[PDB]
Design a protein around this ligand. Structure first.
Ligand SMILES: *[C@@H]1O[C@H](CO)[C@@H](O[C@@H]2O[C@H](CO)[C@@H](O)[C@H](O)[C@H]2NC(C)=O)[C@H](O)[C@H]1NC(C)=O
Ligand SMILES: *[C@@H]1O[C@H](CO)[C@@H](O)[C@H](O)[C@H]1NC(C)=O
Ligand SMILES: *[C@@H]1O[C@H](CO)[C@@H](O)[C@H](O)[C@H]1NC(C)=O
Ligand SMILES: *[C@@H]1O[C@H](CO)[C@@H](O)[C@H](O)[C@H]1NC(C)=O
Ligand SMILES: *[C@@H]1O[C@H](CO)[C@@H](O)[C@H](O)[C@H]1NC(C)=O
Lengths: 236, 234
């Protein structure tokens, strides 16, 4: 005749037991074991402290509760006509915690990559992957295990893992992915995009910005990185 | 894995071995506490303290009923580790035959069927016995007994026997009578019939039920099922 009780890990749980009329003796039990009988402290664990022994209600408190303390707890009352008992289930909760994620990586285009996010908590959290890359389309997925086949430069960016249960606010940790792709070329200027940023070469001074180079007959622009090389020519 | 079993209306002894020293010990009936040390929690007098020594704590449950069946735990409190000892109490009821088939009369070569439903703890063993002398043996080891093409040789009482090994088995019998047309075997003709046939001579006189006596002629015995005549000439 009493509502379930639920507390977070490392908190205090109060187990109350309302009484009426007159009762000879009252007790609290942890499964079969006895915790308190009247004002007699059976179990010697200091976390269990008696709170109220007035006839109106009999209540104890469990401090610094762990998940192992979850289970049924009965308030064994004894009355002359019939003996009554009231069972109460203690439910412990653990905030979600991301135990493992893949470390930050840089990868060549067109390879197989994989991302994982192992999270713990009580109850089991719901893990989701989000593509956090700005200035690009994103996506959310309900797969803990995330695989990418034939990775493209369009898929570079951060990947945020989120593990959530109703116990606490979801916890997030992200991983930045940078995708390596050979350069593609786009007074005299030569625009190109590459990861890592490509060093330009001009062939028959010159200021080299990170995203483009400029030069102040027919000449060719050569853009190159560790993966490959491209040449583009322009005539003035 | 401790276990105890007692018959209804008897006394059951619940022992609990302990070692070293325990602050307080108890015996429990499911969730409720019966005794804690020398403190009598439950108000039922049937649970009496037997041993309050430190080495062992034992109680006894007298006048046990079927409602007293269930688990009983010996809640110990020790500093090093907490131990509990559960014991399952098992109550027993002598077998009781709730239902049997009523007596029947049947024509020879007909179908009959008999049942003997018995209850008890533990499960009783029901057996059917044909009480006709020179019998073969038990006829069914189940509640249900059926006979196909019943013969006059199978008429008689059928004893059901239910035993659960708790107490002496209870038995009840049912008589079946098989109807058969008469068959014949100064002038006497012996014959057998169910119902018993009255003899007639055709062509005083004392006619016993199982044979007739006369003080070309035929002796006629007949009943509700059929008729036969056997003739002899002097
Ligand atoms: C042992 O505990 C039970 C339950 O608290 C006592 O009461 C009976 O419980 C059964 C449930 O299985 C009910 O059907 C009965 O009506 C209850 N009352 C009685 C009088 O049987 C039981 O009495 C306890 N045993 C003893 C010896 O007190
Ligand atoms: C309390 O929690 C237990 C956990 O198994 C559940 O079985 C029970 O129904 C719950 N009771 C209420 C009142 O929610
Ligand atoms: C008894 O209570 C303790 C904490 O008070 C808890 O850890 C344990 O799981 C409970 N049940 C037992 C010991 O069977
Ligand atoms: C990537 O995964 C596919 C899956 O079938 C496999 O066939 C291939 O060998 C893997 N490696 C590559 C494409 O380099
Ligand atoms: C008797 O039982 C037999 C076999 O089970 C069945 O064929 C028949 O219909 C039953 N009734 C009779 C013979 O009157």
């Amino acid at each position: 005749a009493m509502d379930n009780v639920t507390v977070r890990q490392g908190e205090s749980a109060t187990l109350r037991c309302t009484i009426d009329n007159r009762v000879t003796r009252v007790a609290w039990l942890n499964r079969s074991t006895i915790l308190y009988a009247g004002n007699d402290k059976w179990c010697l664990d200091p976390r269990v402290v008696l709170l109220s022994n007035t006839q109106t209600q009999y209540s104890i408190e469990i401090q610094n509760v762990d998940v192992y303390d979850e289970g049924p707890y009965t308030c064994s009352v004894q009355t002359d006509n019939h003996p009554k008992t009231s069972r109460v289930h203690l439910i412990v909760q653990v905030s979600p915690k991301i135990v493992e994620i893949s470390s930050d990586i840089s990868i060549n285009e067109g390879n197989n990559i994989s991302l994982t996010c192992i999270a713990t908590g009580r109850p089991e959290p719901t893990v989701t992957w989000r593509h956090i890359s700005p200035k690009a389309v994103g996506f959310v997925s309900e797969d803990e295990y995330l695989e990418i086949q034939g990775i493209t430069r369009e898929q570079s960016g951060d990947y945020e893992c989120s593990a959530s249960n109703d116990v606490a606010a979801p916890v997030v940790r992200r991983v930045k992915v940078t995708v390596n792709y050979p350069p593609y070329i786009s007074t005299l200027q030569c625009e190109a995009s590459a990861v890592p940023s490509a060093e330009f070469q001009w062939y028959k001074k010159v200021e080299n910005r990170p995203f483009l180079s400029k030069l102040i007959g027919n000449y060719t622009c050569v853009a190159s990185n560790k993966l490959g090389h491209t040449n583009a020519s322009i005539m003035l």
